[PDB]
Design an enzyme around this catalytic site. Structure first.
Site, PDB file in Angstrom:
ATOM      1  N   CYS A 188       5.871  -1.723   4.113  1.00 38.51           N
ATOM      2  CA  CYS A 188       6.122  -3.146   3.888  1.00 38.51           C
ATOM      3  C   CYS A 188       4.836  -3.894   3.617  1.00 38.51           C
ATOM      4  O   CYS A 188       3.811  -3.597   4.223  1.00 38.51           O
ATOM      5  CB  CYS A 188       6.900  -3.755   5.051  1.00 38.51           C
ATOM      6  SG  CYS A 188       8.458  -2.902   5.414  1.00 38.51           S
ATOM      7  N   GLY A 207       6.164   1.283   7.546  1.00 39.20           N
ATOM      8  CA  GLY A 207       4.795   0.807   7.411  1.00 39.20           C
ATOM      9  C   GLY A 207       4.403   0.515   5.968  1.00 39.20           C
ATOM     10  O   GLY A 207       3.314  -0.005   5.718  1.00 39.20           O
ATOM     11  N   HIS A 249       8.573 -10.574   8.188  1.00 33.01           N
ATOM     12  CA  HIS A 249       9.115  -9.747   9.270  1.00 33.01           C
ATOM     13  C   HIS A 249       8.007  -9.049  10.078  1.00 33.01           C
ATOM     14  O   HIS A 249       8.329  -8.337  11.009  1.00 33.01           O
ATOM     15  CB  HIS A 249      10.227  -8.764   8.839  1.00 33.01           C
ATOM     16  CG  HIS A 249       9.795  -7.627   7.967  1.00 33.01           C
ATOM     17  ND1 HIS A 249       9.991  -7.658   6.603  1.00 33.01           N
ATOM     18  CD2 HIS A 249       9.261  -6.429   8.299  1.00 33.01           C
ATOM     19  CE1 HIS A 249       9.524  -6.509   6.144  1.00 33.01           C
ATOM     20  NE2 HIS A 249       9.068  -5.742   7.121  1.00 33.01           N
TER      21      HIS A 249
HETATM   22  O1  OYF Z   1      13.308  -2.194   5.865  1.00 31.19           O
HETATM   23  C1  OYF Z   1      12.507  -1.980   6.770  1.00 31.19           C
HETATM   24  N1  OYF Z   1      11.757  -0.860   6.837  1.00 31.19           N
HETATM   25  C2  OYF Z   1      11.288  -0.028   5.806  1.00 31.19           C
HETATM   26  C3  OYF Z   1      11.006  -0.439   4.504  1.00 31.19           C
HETATM   27  N2  OYF Z   1      10.806   0.374   3.463  1.00 31.19           N
HETATM   28  C4  OYF Z   1      10.914   1.677   3.673  1.00 31.19           C
HETATM   29  C5  OYF Z   1      11.212   2.255   4.929  1.00 31.19           C
HETATM   30  C6  OYF Z   1      11.421   3.636   5.160  1.00 31.19           C
HETATM   31  N3  OYF Z   1      11.741   4.152   6.341  1.00 31.19           N
HETATM   32  C7  OYF Z   1      11.877   3.306   7.372  1.00 31.19           C
HETATM   33  C8  OYF Z   1      11.714   1.956   7.282  1.00 31.19           C
HETATM   34  C9  OYF Z   1      11.377   1.379   6.034  1.00 31.19           C
HETATM   35  C10 OYF Z   1      12.360  -2.925   7.966  1.00 31.19           C
HETATM   36  C11 OYF Z   1      12.747  -2.266   9.307  1.00 31.19           C
HETATM   37  C12 OYF Z   1      14.241  -2.063   9.375  1.00 31.19           C
HETATM   38  O2  OYF Z   1      14.968  -3.297   9.243  1.00 31.19           O
HETATM   39  C13 OYF Z   1      14.573  -4.112   8.211  1.00 31.19           C
HETATM   40  C14 OYF Z   1      15.509  -5.047   7.797  1.00 31.19           C
HETATM   41  C15 OYF Z   1      15.146  -6.013   6.877  1.00 31.19           C
HETATM   42  C16 OYF Z   1      13.851  -6.044   6.412  1.00 31.19           C
HETATM   43 CL1  OYF Z   1      13.364  -7.321   5.349  1.00 31.19          CL
HETATM   44  C17 OYF Z   1      12.917  -5.106   6.798  1.00 31.19           C
HETATM   45  C18 OYF Z   1      13.279  -4.096   7.685  1.00 31.19           C
END
Ligand code: OYF
Ligand code: OYF
Lengths: 304, 304
Positions: free
Chosen positions: B145, B143, B41
């Site tokens: 990820c 961030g 992603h």
């Molecule tokens: O999860 C995600 N963001 C984060 C991850 N972990 C912690 C966080 C905390 N706070 C905001 C964001 C975060 C991303 C962006 C949102 O939409 C998606 C949807 C599916 C996938 Cl695979 C990734 C994302």
């Protein structure tokens, strides 16, 4: 989101861990520049620990008697001195992996990460707090002595603790990096009173703010209190009295959540007088006091 | 003595953390040999995440579009490919700090250490467990990820997890190092059911053995049980059913303490039916399930 008892990344500290052997005793040493810092009880046998005369025990030791091993390479010891309860072994080689560092004496209630070591090798890392009575509730086995506590601000490691002793009560005692014990402890295998410990009030309030930030809000109520009314409750429950300095340090969290500090104090008062009623806050069934207001802000903002 | 939620020392993993930028998205990458592994992603904007066609989004990207930065030095990308939900960026330089490593898919209930990162920089390390429903209760911000989960056996790092997503429920989902999600999660900003989670029974029993080893013995009783009687209780309290494999893995702890596994099961049964009555076990007011029998043995023996 999510709230964890996070420790600082331990790499900068792993690169300083060495093994120190003296006679039959082996413990861990901290190699920064051309100096290895270790607990002075490395010169004692188990029978010496009952009532040791460290000056006299060290007099029988020479630089060649201190074996310092970093990974698999031996360090040549060219100087030795005792500073309070630590030995400083001058080696002929500066540690190439010495990070930017400071030696600091932390205050009771402050937190730090411990890198538990055995035979100069790191086995794990955990975040803990210096209790108000100057002990730490660590996880230490025989050979863990010389393990250090630290904080990290960007690239600078502030070494604050060196493990020395496990009290018969199962709690841990140790020194700053100048060999000064936290608390009244002496490096002897003798009866030693840890003292009455209290709960770090400012840290519990900080952790209650991290709960509101992360969604756990059930404990919030329609009440408020005053510093004096709250402190009467804190007294009854062996909590450290809350001062205006504690309120001031909680300012950033109070600003982020929009919940006044005394309003959060009223919530803490109700949790103290009524318990959790079988509920949890941030996955915990007790009031957590090992996160400082700085730790909650750091974890909720993402400081690297 | 003392029992802590200890994480593995994070140094070997810090040396692999890089920053990966694609367009306007920045997340963390894992640099092992001449390959950077990151969540696929990284090629999506926030609007793409609603229903992304990753094959089509990646087709618009070239090696020069992926900016990989290690510390302060840029890595030259010479290849890119998508494997499940991860991107593999072939860089022209092998990471000099690549440790001995394995890519492993852990089982639900197993534990691992997470090194939380932002912009390729490590901010903290915590020990956590892969829940029976394949989510992790981590601490992750935007961030984060690309942050990885791992275990360490002497010098070999077994990478088991890469963070991808935070579910609306506040729990975390991610993949193994081949890009396969744990659980039924997809990398889309859509409604996703985590599923019914249970308590890891073998881990609670293991933690009860660590309590006996470390002195907390109040929960020990004059009773015993059978696997079937215990499992009826486990069912009522949403605990994973205990099998003979779980009993077998508890053998070493049962041998060290001299308390038969079914006798410890009887203690767990009474704690489930009666609660803690305001008491604590290893400083906790709930039954801890994030320590495996291997973790308790490792911590109580001192494996480095
Ligand atoms: O999860 C995600 N963001 C984060 C991850 N972990 C912690 C966080 C905390 N706070 C905001 C964001 C975060 C991303 C962006 C949102 O939409 C998606 C949807 C599916 C996938 Cl695979 C990734 C994302
Ligand atoms: O505390 C010590 N040993 C340990 C430290 N930490 C954890 C442990 C766990 N399990 C056995 C031993 C341990 C040493 C040896 C005992 O007598 C004393 C007395 C004072 C001083 Cl300063 C050190 C020691």
């Amino acid at each position: 989101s999510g709230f964890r008892k996070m420790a600082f990344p331990s790499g900068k500290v792993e690169g300083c861990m060495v093994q120190v052997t003296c006679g039959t005793t082996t413990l861990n040493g901290l190699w920064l520049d051309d100096v290895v810092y270790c607990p002075r009880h490395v010169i004692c046998t188990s029978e010496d620990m009952l009532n040791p005369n460290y000056e006299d025990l060290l007099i029988r030791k020479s630089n060649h008697n201190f074996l310092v091993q970093a990974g698999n390479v031996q360090l040549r010891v060219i100087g030795h001195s005792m500073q309070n309860c630590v030995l400083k072994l001058k080696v002929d080689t500066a540690n190439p992996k010495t990070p930017k560092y400071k030696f600091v004496r932390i205050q009771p209630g402050q937190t730090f990460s411990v890198l538990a070591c055995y035979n100069g090798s790191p086995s794990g890392v955990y975040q803990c707090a210096m209790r108000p009575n100057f002990t730490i509730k660590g996880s230490f086995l025989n050979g863990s002595c010389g393990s250090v506590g630290f904080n990290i601000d960007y690239d600078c490691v502030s070494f604050c603790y060196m493990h020395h002793m496990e009290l018969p009560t199962g709690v841990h005692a140790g020194t700053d990096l100048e060999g000064n014990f936290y608390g009244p402890f002496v490096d002897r295998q003798t009866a030693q009173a840890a003292g009455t410990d209290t709960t770090i009030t400012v840290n519990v309030l900080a952790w209650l703010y991290a709960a509101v930030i992360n969604g756990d809000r059930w404990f919030l109520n329609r009440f408020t209190t005053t510093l004096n009314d709250f402190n009467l409750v804190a007294m009854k429950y062996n909590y450290e009295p809350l001062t205006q300095d504690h309120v001031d340090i909680l300012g950033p969290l109070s600003a982020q959540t929009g919940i006044a500090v005394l309003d959060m104090c009223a919530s803490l008062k109700e949790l103290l007088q009524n318990g959790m009623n079988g509920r949890t806050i941030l996955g915990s069934a007790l009031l957590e006091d090992e996160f400082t207001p700085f730790d909650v802000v750091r974890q909720c903002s993402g400081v690297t």
